[PDB]
Design a protein around this ligand. Structure first.
Ligand SMILES: O=C(O)c1ccccc1O
Lengths: 49, 50, 49
């Protein structure tokens, strides 16, 4: 192994979280993975710093 | 009326979510806000009148 | 580690606990300002950034 050049290994990503109550309204986003509200503008460069 | 200062407005477009900030010589900030919003087609909470 | 002389692997599992609250009591206060405009749209303002 001391003669081997760096070899990157295959990545693996798993996230586990809890789903919201089965009877929760579609408009009640508390507990849901809602993306950051400014993420689209951040990705487009429209978000103002 | 002949107010010494005539009508004047400065509108600043932020570029985010239809946001706009305006500096206006007006007695009605509310109507200025809703009217600008109505014309733009965005919710009133996106417009700031000062 | 037995099959490698110049490369080794390590493994460790550790816990953590973190007290929640400013340790300066008076900093644990928050304010918010909410306006509902006539078109029904809401503008929320709060002390956080
Ligand atoms: O974490 C704290 O206890 C704290 C206390 C005062 C000011 C900033 C802080 O983060």
């Amino acid at each position: 192994s001391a003669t081997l050049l760096f070899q990157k290994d295959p990545p693996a990503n798993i996230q586990l979280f809890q789903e919201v109550p089965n009877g929760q309204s579609k408009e009640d986003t508390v507990g849901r993975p809602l993306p950051h509200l400014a993420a689209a503008m951040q990705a487009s460069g429209e978000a103002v710093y | 009326h002949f107010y010494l200062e005539t009508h004047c407005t400065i509108a600043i477009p932020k570029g985010e979510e239809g946001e706009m900030e305006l500096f206006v010589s007006t007695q009605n900030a509310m109507k200025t806000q809703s009217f600008v919003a109505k014309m733009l087609g965005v919710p009133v909470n996106r417009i700031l009148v000062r | 580690n037995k099959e490698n002389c110049w490369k080794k692997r390590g493994l460790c599992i550790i816990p953590t606990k973190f007290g929640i609250s400013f340790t300066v009591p008076f900093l644990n206060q928050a304010g918010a300002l909410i306006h509902v405009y006539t078109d029904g749209s809401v503008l929320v303002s709060h002390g956080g950034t």
